[PDB]
């Protein structure tokens, strides 16, 4: 999961 | 907005809509090239391909099981361009690069016809 | 293999089911959440979801065109679960991350599970 | 495109  | 994003989401989904084609699972179309037939999932073809697009949002073709494309289509090529679009990959060899063209713009697919072009460009 | 790949192939399929989804095209099934009603593709449900997948390759319910979930089911977490789906995204809030993560067990979304249990775990 |  990532901070898009 | 303040979402996070799941890196693998979009290929686990293609990975998972390439088994439910291998295992012929709610598959609602035949594409018939020639001699031979495809099985696929008509929403996955408008994804990959501008022709698929404006033929299945047709409001009469869009009930259509069966679909015949022009006698001068490569079943070859359409094979390997069907695999590309439930996989991402592209099996382009010096041996179908033609046929793959040919039919990557038939179907309207220009990512494809780009690629096809750089491959041709660089044997010259 | 010698296939090439194209990297934004699987994140371009989604973003068009997406449009497809949005603009209502050649969706096959609506998901029934207490009085909230979700229109979807079978295909991309059962890509995204272990209990999709087991409910859309039973031999009865595969024909289906109505699904009603448990009414334990909150319809803002289902409609959160449904928008990660189709774009990647997860919506999660302080407010919504219980009943997101209650939904997410429901439908069997392992890694949606997985990044709740660690959000909730944080905050601890 | 890429070597996959
Ligand atoms: O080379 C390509 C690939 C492709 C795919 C689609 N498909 C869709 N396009 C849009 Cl805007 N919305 C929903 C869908 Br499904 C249209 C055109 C093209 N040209
Ligand atoms: O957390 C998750 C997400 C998910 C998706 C599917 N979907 C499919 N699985 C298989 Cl093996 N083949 C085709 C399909 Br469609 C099955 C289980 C799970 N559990
Ligand atoms: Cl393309
Ligand atoms: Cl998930």
Same mark, same amino acid.
């Given at each position: 999961?990532?901070?898009? | ?11 686990? &989904? ?15 179309? &035949? ?10 999932? =008509? ?14 949002? %047709?409001?009469? =073709? ?7 494309? %022009? ?11 069907? %695999? ?33 072009? =750089?491959?041709? =460009?660089?044997?010259?």
């Amino acid at each position: 999961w990532v901070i898009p | 907005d303040s979402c996070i994003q799941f890196t693998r989401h979009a290929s686990d &989904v293609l990975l998972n809509l390439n088994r439910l084609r291998s295992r012929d699972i709610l598959t609602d179309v &035949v594409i018939v090239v020639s001699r031979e037939q495809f099985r696929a999932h =008509k929403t996955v073809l408008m994804a990959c391909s501008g022709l698929f697009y404006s033929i299945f949002t %047709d409001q009469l =073709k869009c009930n259509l099981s069966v679909i015949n494309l %022009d006698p001068e289509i490569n079943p070859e090529g359409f094979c390997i361009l069907l %695999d590309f679009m439930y996989t991402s990959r592209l099996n382009l060899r010096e041996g179908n690069i033609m046929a793959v063209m040919a039919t990557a713009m038939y179907l309207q697919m220009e990512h494809v016809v780009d690629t096809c072009r =750089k491959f041709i =460009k660089a044997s010259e």
